[PDB]
A paper describes a structure:
Ene-reductases (ERs) from the family of the Old Yellow Enzyme (OYE; E.C. 1.6.99.1) are nicotinamide-dependent flavoproteins catalyzing the asymmetric hydrogenation of a wide panel of activated alkenes (e.g., α,β-unsaturated ketones, aldehydes, nitroalkenes, carboxylic acids, and derivatives). We selected a new thermophilic ene-reductase homologue in Chloroflexus aggregans, a peculiar filamentous bacterium. We report here on the functional and structural characterization of this new enzyme, which we called CaOYE. Produced in high yields in recombinant form, it proved to be a robust biocatalyst showing high thermostability, good solvent tolerance and a wide range of pH optimum.
CaOYE was solved and refined in C2221 orthorhombic space group, with 4 molecules per ASU. The enzyme accommodates one molecule of FMN cofactor on the top of the β-barrel core, at the C-terminus side, buried within the active site cavity (for further details). In agreement with the general behavior of Class III OYEs, crystal contacts support a dimeric architecture, despite native gel analysis and size exclusion chromatography suggesting the protein behaves as a monomer in solution (respectively). The interaction surface between monomers in the functional dimer covers 1451 Å2. As already reported for the other described Class III OYEs, the C-terminus of each monomer stretches through an “Arg finger” (in our case Arg352) reaching the active site of the adjacent monomer, interacting with the respective flavin cofactor and vice versa. The difference electronic density map Fo–Fc shows an elongated organic molecule, most likely malonate, present within the crystallization precipitant agents, lying above the isoalloxazine ring of FMN. In the complex with malonate, one carboxylate oxygen of the compound forms a hydrogen bond with the side chains of His177 but not with His180. The other carboxylate moiety of malonate is involved in a network of hydrogen bonding interactions with Tyr28, Cys25 and Arg352 of the adjacent monomer that explores the active site, suggesting a role for all these residues in substrate bonding and positioning.
Residue numbers in the entry:
A (entry chain A), B (entry chain C): 1 to 354
The structure:
Amino acid sequence: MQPHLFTPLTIGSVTLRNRIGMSPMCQYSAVDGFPTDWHLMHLGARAAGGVGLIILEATAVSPEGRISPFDLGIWSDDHIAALSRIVKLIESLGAVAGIQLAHAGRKASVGRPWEGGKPIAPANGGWPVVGPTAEPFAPGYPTPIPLDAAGIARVVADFATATKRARAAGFRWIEIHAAHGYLLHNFLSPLGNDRNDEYGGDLRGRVRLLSEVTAAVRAEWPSDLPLAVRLSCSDWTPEGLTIADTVEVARMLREQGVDLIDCSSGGIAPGITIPVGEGYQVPFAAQVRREANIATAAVGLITRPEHADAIVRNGDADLVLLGRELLRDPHWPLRAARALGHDLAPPPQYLRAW
Amino acid sequence: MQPHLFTPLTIGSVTLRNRIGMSPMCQYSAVDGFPTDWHLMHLGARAAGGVGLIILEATAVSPEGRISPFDLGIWSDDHIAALSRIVKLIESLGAVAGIQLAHAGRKASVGRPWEGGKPIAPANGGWPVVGPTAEPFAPGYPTPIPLDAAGIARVVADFATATKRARAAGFRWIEIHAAHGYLLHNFLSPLGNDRNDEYGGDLRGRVRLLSEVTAAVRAEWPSDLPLAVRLSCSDWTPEGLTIADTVEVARMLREQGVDLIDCSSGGIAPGITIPVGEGYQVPFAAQVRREANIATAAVGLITRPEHADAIVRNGDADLVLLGRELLRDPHWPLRAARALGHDLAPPPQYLRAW
Ligand SMILES: Cc1cc2nc3c(=O)[nH]c(=O)nc-3n(C[C@H](O)[C@H](O)[C@H](O)COP(=O)(O)O)c2cc1C
Ligand SMILES: Cc1cc2nc3c(=O)[nH]c(=O)nc-3n(C[C@H](O)[C@H](O)[C@H](O)COP(=O)(O)O)c2cc1C
C-alpha cells in the first residue's frame, strides 16, 4: 500500500502510466527551431520503451534564448505543426508528451556540446545575449545586455505566447526551465546578480522574474493540465542558492499554481566542484517535497531499477527522471518492470520478443 | 586479414560498417501498404544503435502477396516517397537501408500475429490467395487458385517492378523472401506441393519459379548493389527440402548473380517439430558457405556478442542477423562492441551517455 515505480500518477486530468520520465535532453538537431525525423525517432523510442512521461528538450521561447542555433524552438506558430506530430507519436505509444520552455540567458549563443561547446561570436552567426547584469559567464563569453523593464516584459510575453503554442500542439505537461545558469536561474542566484532594483538584492527580488514568468505561463495553461518548474536547487558554494532558498521558491511557486518541482542543480558558473554520484540530487527532491508540500521529480545518475523504486516508495519524489540511462537504453522501463516484477506490455509489434 | 564482427563487408559499391544486420521483421503497422511514424522510429532506432545493415520487413510486391492487410507494400509508385524518407533516416545514421520483397502466396490474407493471426475471408477485407496447387496450408485456410502460364509471369513481373521501385527509393540491398511457407518456398518444397508441370515434380522444376524471379530481380537491380535470397534451408522433415537441396539451389543462385544466401528454415506446413536453440540455423549458413562458395547470413536465436563474433571469425557466415534481440535492444551493437573491445561511437547526440 505504498507508491512504487509502476504506480500511475494523476495531476489534473493527466495520468502517467508509471513514475518514469525521460528528462528534458537537448539534441542540438533542429534547423530554425524546427525538428527533424531524428526527433520523432529519438523521443518515440523512449515512449515505446514504456516511460510514462516524455519531456521534450529545452525549447526556446525566442531565437536569442536558444543555447545553440540547433535548438528546438517555439517562437512562431509555424512550430506548432511538427511538434504536434511528435505529440501524436508519443501518445499513440501510451506516454504523456511534455515540453520544457527555456531561455538560455547569458549562456545562449554557444556551439553544440559535441563540437567543444564554444561560444559563437556574432560574426559567425552568433547573437548578443541577455541577463540581469553585464557580467559574462566565464572568460571568452559575451557581455550580456542587462534586461530593463521593456526586455523583462518581452520575456514574460514570450513565455506566455510559447505556452499557447504548446497547448495548441497538444502537450499535456509543461516545464519551465529555471535551472542550469540560464536566464531564470541567473536572476534567482546571487552569484550572477548585482542588480539592486526590484529584480535583485533580496530573495523576493531575485525571484521576481521567475514569478512573473510562472504567472504568465500558468494563466495560459489550463488549470486542468500539469505545470512544472525545473530549479537549480543548489549552486554548491556557500555564497549562492542553497536548498533552503529553493524551498522558499518552491513554496511561492506552489502558491502560484505550479504542480511539481523538478529538482536539478549546478550551472550558474564554471569551476564549482559538484559532488556527482548515484542519486546525488535526490536529497533536494526529498526536502522540497516534504517542506514545500509539492510533488517533485528526482534526477541525476539514477540508473538502477531498485534505486528508482526506492525513491518513489520512500516518498523522496513522485517522479523519477532518467537522462543518460535512457539514451543508453530506451527500453529501460521494460527491463525495470521485469527486474521489479511488475506488469508492462511492450509495443504489440514486439510481443514475440519478450 | 580475416574478419570479426566489426570488420567492414564489401559487395559491389556497398560497404557495411560491420557484420551486424537487422533481420527483416513484419510490424503489421501499415495501411494500404504505406508506413507510419511507427516504421520511421522503429527502423531509425536500430540504425541509431549502430547496426551496419537494416533490412526492412517483408514488403509485398502485390496486394494479394501481403501476409496481412497491414503489411508494408511496394506494389505502387505511390510507395516510393515514404520509403525513401525511411532510407534517408537510415543512411543519415551510418547504416545501409535494405528491403525484403515478398509474396505470402498460399499463407496470404491473414490477421496480425497478436490478433490470433487467423485467416481473414474476402467478405471481410481478405482476398483469394494464390500458389502452386489447390491445396490449403492447414485446416481453415483458403483454397489457393493454382498459378498458370499467366499467373506465373505476373508474379515474376511484380517482383521486377517492386525492384525498380526499391532502386528509386534508394535501398542499396535487396533480399527475396523465398522462405517461411511463402510463394517461392511453396513451389520449391515437395511438402504440400504436388505440382507436375515444368514448375513441379523434380528439383529442376520446383526451383523454376524462384530462378525466374531471381533473374527478373537481378536484371532490374544494378550490378554494383548486393542481392540476397532468404531460403528455408530445411523442412525439418524426411521427405522435404534438406541442406543438400539448399546447397544445390544456392549454387544456382550464385550463377544467377545472387550475392548472399540468408539462411533461415521452417514454415512449409504446421506440425513440424523444429529443434530451436541458440544458433540452430548456423550449421546451415556454414554448409551453404562451404559447398556453394557463396557469402551467407546466419540468423536464429543469436543474442550473445561473442557468439555472433565467433560465427564471423570461424567463417560460419559473413553476416549475423538479429531479430528479437534488436526488438528488445536496439542498441545491441554498441554493447557488443564494448564487450569485445571494438570502438563504436553512438550518435553524437548521445556521446554524453557513453
Ligand atoms: C544530452 C543531454 C541533454 C540535456 N538537455 C537538457 C535540457 O535540455 N534541459 C534540461 O533541463 N536538462 C538537460 N540535461 C540534463 C538532464 O536533463 C538531467 O537533469 C541530468 O542529466 C540527469 O542525470 P542523468 O542524465 O544521469 O539521468 C541534458 C543532459 C544530457 C546528457
Ligand atoms: C515480429 C517478427 C516478425 C518477423 N517478420 C519476418 C519477415 O517479415 N520476414 C522474414 O523473413 N522473417 C521474419 N521474421 C523472422 C526473423 O526475421 C528471424 O529470421 C528469426 O526470428 C531469427 O531469429 P531471432 O529473432 O532470434 O534473431 C520475423 C520474426 C519476428 C519475431
